[PDB]
Amino acid sequence: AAAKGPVVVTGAAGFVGSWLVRKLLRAGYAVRATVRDPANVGKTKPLLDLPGAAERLSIWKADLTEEGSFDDAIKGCTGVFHVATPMDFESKDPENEVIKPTVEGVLSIMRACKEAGTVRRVVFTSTAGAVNVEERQKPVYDENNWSDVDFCRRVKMTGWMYFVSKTLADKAAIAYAAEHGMDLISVIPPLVIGPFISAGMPPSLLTALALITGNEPHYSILKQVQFVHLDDLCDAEIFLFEHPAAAGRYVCSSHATTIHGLAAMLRERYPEYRIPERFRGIDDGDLQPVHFSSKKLLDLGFAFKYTVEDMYDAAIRTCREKGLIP
Ligand SMILES: NC(=O)c1ccc[n+]([C@@H]2O[C@H](COP(=O)([O-])OP(=O)(O)OC[C@H]3O[C@@H](n4cnc5c(N)ncnc54)[C@H](OP(=O)(O)O)[C@@H]3O)[C@@H](O)[C@H]2O)c1
Numbered sequence: 531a532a533a534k535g536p537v538v539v540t541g542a543a544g545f546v547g548s549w550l551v552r553k554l555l556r557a558g559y560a561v562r563a564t565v566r567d568p569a570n571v572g573k574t575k576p577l578l579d580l581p582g583a584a585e586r587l588s589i590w591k592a593d594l595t596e597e598g599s600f601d602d603a604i605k606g607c608t609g610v611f612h613v614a615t616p617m618d619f620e621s622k623d624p625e626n627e628v629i630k631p632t633v634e635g636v637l638s639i640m641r642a643c644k645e646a647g648t649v650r651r652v653v654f655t656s657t658a659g660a661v662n663v664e665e666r667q668k669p670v671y672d673e674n675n676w677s678d679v680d681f682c683r684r685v686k687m688t689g690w691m692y693f694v695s696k697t698l699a700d701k702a703a704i705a706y707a708a709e710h711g712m713d714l715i716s717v718i719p720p721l722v723i724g725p726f727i728s729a730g731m732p733p734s735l736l737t738a739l740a741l742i743t744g745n746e747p748h749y750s751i752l753k754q755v756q757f758v759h760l761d762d763l764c765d766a767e768i769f770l771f772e773h774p775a776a777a778g779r780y781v782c783s784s785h786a787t788t789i790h791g792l793a794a795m796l797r798e799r800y801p802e803y804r805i806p807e808r809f810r811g812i813d814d815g816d817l818q819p820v821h822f823s824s825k826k827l828l829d830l831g832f833a834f835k836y837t838v839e840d841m842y843d844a845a846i847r848t849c850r851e852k853g854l855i856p
């Protein structure tokens with residue numbers, strides 16, 4: 531058969547984007563992978579080495595801060611997977627340097643998609659930080675819950691600008707799509723764990739593996755955390771792109787637990803690494819999982835393939851090669 535319609539993946543050199551490019555290639559797609567510097571071979575080479583990239587992968591230069599930088603890559607495509615997002619959070623002007631750029635970059639992508647005229651559906655990768663960041667945590671969250679931007683700007687917890695960046699970018703994309711009759715899917719992943727192709731530790735694996743290492747500043751994140759295997763997320767993003775009935779936001783979380791429960795699992799399953807018994811900055815006593823419901827996606831027929839055990843087994847190995855002690 532022929533390639534299943536040219537699709538674009540923004541941020542293809544990244545943790546999520548590189549794997550989605552892989553999975554889209556395996557699924558029979560012609561993939562137009564976007565990067566800020568097609569010349570940085572350290573970042574681009576792992577993509578070109580992917581199975582099937584020689585025939586159906588092409589690399590394009592684009593930057594969310596440069597208007598029109600994406601028009602060429604999008605022209606003639608049937609779909610666009612927006613995965614790139616500004617990841618700088620050591621800013622002194624978070625607003626004009628992280629927030630507005632994130633919101634203006636997604637809207638420019640949406641504008642490019644509408645003007646291309648060939649795109650049938652846009653898949654925006656959101657984050658759980660656009661759902662459950664509020665003063666009083668609920669026991670269950672789904673695609674109808676939205677983070678409280680005002681509360682984020684008020685208390686300015688660690689990582690506040692990213693949550694607000696992504697929550698506004700999510701709302702912006704949805705509004706633009708509704709105003710212009712565009713078909714937009716919004717996929718909400720929690721902390722993503724899985725293999726990686728870069729030679730640098732993905733940030734989400736720093737958090738996921740903070741209990742084996744000693745990354746105590748990451749303990750607060752694991753307090754009440756949800757996970758998804760990177761492979762399941764990328765599969766779900768392809769599933770949602772191909773299902774004609776999909777529409778709107780989708781939660782893509784397959785596991786919810788607490789720091790205590792995770793430490794328990796790692797103790798029993800990895801006697802080799804020493805797991806702390808008391809975690810700095812947590813202490814206290816009663817923590818109950820906060821669940822992210824994926825019922826909308828599962829109802830459409832999607833099924834998760836991997837367990838949290840599968841996630842760490844794969845994260846360990848790809849890091850045991852380099853980046854972590856054995
Ligand atoms: N990993 C998780 O746990 C998780 C959970 C929920 C949602 N997400 C979302 O998944 C998506 C991918 O994130 P990630 O985990 O894979 O982190 P990542 O590896 O840092 O990927 C981010 C990508 O965005 C690109 N990027 C940054 N600024 C850009 C710009 N101005 N123009 C074009 N590209 C730019 C980066 O390319 P450069 O190499 O050139 O900087 C980078 O490849 C994000 O939208 C994230 O919010 C991730």
Ligand SMILES: O=C1c2c(O)cc(O)cc2O[C@H](c2ccc(O)c(O)c2)[C@H]1O
Pocket residue numbers: 656657658659660662663719720721733734737754755756
């Ligand atoms: O994007 C996300 C993210 C990320 O990209 C990088 C990183 O290092 C940690 C992260 O954690 C976020 C998160 C997970 C579970 C939640 O309950 C929540 O509110 C937020 C996640 O959404």
